[PDB]
Amino acid sequence: MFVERSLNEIRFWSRIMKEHSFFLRLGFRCEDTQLIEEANQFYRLFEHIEQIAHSYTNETDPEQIKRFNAEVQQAATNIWGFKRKILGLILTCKLPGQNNFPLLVDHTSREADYFRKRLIQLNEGKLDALPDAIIKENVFFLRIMADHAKFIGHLLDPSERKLVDTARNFSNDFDELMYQAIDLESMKPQSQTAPLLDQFLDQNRVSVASLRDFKKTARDLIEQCKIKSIIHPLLADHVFREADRFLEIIDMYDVHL
């Protein structure tokens, strides 16, 4: 259902790109003034997109929404190229002193691209059949979960030994499920049977729910200032919502099967 889904995607992901520019900005060196401005530009861009998405509704004219999709797709492409650009400066050591992790940069670029791609599937009636969506969403989100588990463990203060270790065991849980998901993807279309796919979702579910439960707790502790970390609480909430979205997808794909 094109209008339904378009707006869901955009409401969620544009909040994400908006938040991304804030985080990337926090990690720029103070003197990198052009990059700080770009970041602020993209901040307001996606902020604006966000407001527009919320002001639409299921009863909005499909054509108007197709144009919005096309427009949001172009913003998703522009934040993407911006992230790449930062990645190349960091990776060539052009920004000594800077505090963006290359992996987080690449990470946020993959989500931007997940976003632009989804918009194209929508505007093209090229959504995926259930067998393909189960594999591709999982292969995608399981890497994203594994990434978050490392961001948290890296941004936790090293004195927080027990929570650093807990995030470490989540970073290994998802490293390993991502690999099962990579194998399952190579064995397609042969792997794409009812019983293999149901088991695959079954097994991912218990972890994601656990991780989601963990990001929530972590978020509340950070907000209450109960732990030591360089984790901005908006970041903690952000990865919580990404986890929570993965879990909804997993649960709805398990209903469709």
Residue 9 vs 242, nearer CB to Mg ion: 242
* Nearest one of 146, 162, 154, 164 to 211, comparing CA atoms: 146
Do 77 and 116 form a contact (C-beta atoms < 8 A)?
yes
The answer to whether residue 242 forms part of the interface with Mg ion (CB under 5 A) is yes
Span near a copy of itself by CB under 8 A; candidates 1-9, 47-55, 69-77, 218-226: 218-226
Span near a copy of itself by CB under 8 A; candidates 53-61, 115-123, 198-206, 210-218: 198-206
Residue 39 vs 72, nearer CB to a copy of itself: 39
Phi and psi torsions of 230, nearest 5°: -105, 35
Least distance CB 223 / a copy of itself (angstroms)? 8
Least distance CB 167 / Fe ion (angstroms)? 17
Which tokens sit at 108?
């946020």
Least distance CB 40 / a copy of itself (angstroms)? 12
The answer to whether residue 184 forms part of the interface with a copy of itself (CB under 8 A) is yes
Query: Residue 156 forms beta bridges with which residues?
Result: 229
- 193-197, Cβ contacts within 8 angstroms, sequence gap of 24 or more: 194/257, 197/131, 197/134, 197/135, 197/257
Do 180 and 138 form a contact (C-beta atoms < 8 A)?
no
Residues 104-143 as x/- pattern, contact with Mg ion by CB under 5 A: ----------------------------------------
Which tokens sit at 179?
């690999």
